[PDB]
Amino acid sequence: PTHLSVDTKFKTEGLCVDIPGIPKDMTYRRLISMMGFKMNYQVNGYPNMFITREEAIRHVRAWIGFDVEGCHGTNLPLQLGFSTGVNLVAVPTPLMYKGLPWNVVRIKIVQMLSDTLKNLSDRVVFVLWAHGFELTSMKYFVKIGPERTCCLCDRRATCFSTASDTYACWHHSIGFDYVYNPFMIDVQQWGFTGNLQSNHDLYCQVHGNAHVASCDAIMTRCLAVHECFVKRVDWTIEYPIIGDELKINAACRKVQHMVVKAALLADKFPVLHDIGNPKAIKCVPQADVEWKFYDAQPCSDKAYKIEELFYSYHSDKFTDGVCLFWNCNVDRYPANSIVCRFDTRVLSNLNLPGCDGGSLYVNKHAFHTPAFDKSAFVNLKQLPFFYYSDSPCESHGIDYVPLKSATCITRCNLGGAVCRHHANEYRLYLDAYNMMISAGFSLWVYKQFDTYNLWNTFT
Ligand SMILES: COc1ccc2[nH]cc(CN(C)C)c2c1
Ligand SMILES: [Zn+2]
Ligand SMILES: [Zn+2]
């Protein structure tokens, strides 16, 4: 059970309005043949054009919703819509382009897919709600054959050039005109009742239907994301490294230790309530405080209601001490909290568009995160940058320039002059802090938090 067999059945009911008379008995093999393609009994790494739900999940970063709406079928012009918000018009002779022949439209499709997927995936997965036109229009922009490598690098081939007879990946396809060996999945095969809008609108209110091909392409990918990442959650799937994944995770650990440690020194809470990751360890292991853990898995649909996390009768008195919500999304945080909430609006290679305002954050694992809402932090304020260190001033073992900063809470800075060791550690921590903030994370803390209370922790 590795790939989707070509001898698997394909439900043709959704295709009979664009293709009337389509036989009820259909296999993927017969479908691909009908689409104008020949697999020629090729055991060269491309066993089927269509892929399984399991394979689609592993290749989520390659997902591009695709829809084709007839404007007027070799006689009539077609509207090609993609989840990128692009709308191209092909002639046979919400960015809306005018009518142009297939030879020029295929060039634009290559450029668009390459600019979208070069820093995301090694392929493309056309996410369909197949009705006919999208499948029968693929022979005009897709070429297939054995698995190949790029003519300028070692990545797999994703494009083909009829001008130079060569193959390229998304990084080196400038001037390329055919999509080489794409993948696709028909969401309609998963067994649904009713049309795309009825199913999409059951879960999402952010994507509307404007009756343009790209709106359907958007609702299609959004629905597929809901079914595989919102209602069904598999955190055992590993995702390859494509960016600053390691620096981001490392920074999150350094920032959490710093924030939680300084908070316990400034206000000296008797007890900390650790609400979140059931696998969690104390982020500040040498703290005087009482560490109480409460298990909560990452919510993928709606943010937890603070009433169901705390009430229904644990210290029970969460009001005593401080609550720590590190990536645990709740509707409204109590006033005595320390919070790290991911901002779903962040633009990055790790963050993919989500369902109902949420985003799919892919860093080692896929986490669909509910929509960012600034009203959840009414009882808190944003946590400002600060660097704290009780460690001794001792350099050990990189060229220096004296550091002058009001946010370097150290004994040397208290004494008037920042030592080389704390200036080195401050600059590194500020880099990790900036890395984390830029990745989309947001820090919030109780209103009474004041870094001025850290200066007397050295006497
Ligand atoms: C710790 O961060 C990551 C992020 C993405 C990753 N993909 C593969 C690995 C390897 N890991 C299992 C050690 C990974 C780690
Ligand atoms: Zn290449
Ligand atoms: Zn949606």
Ligand SMILES: [Zn+2]
């Ligand atoms: Zn120092």
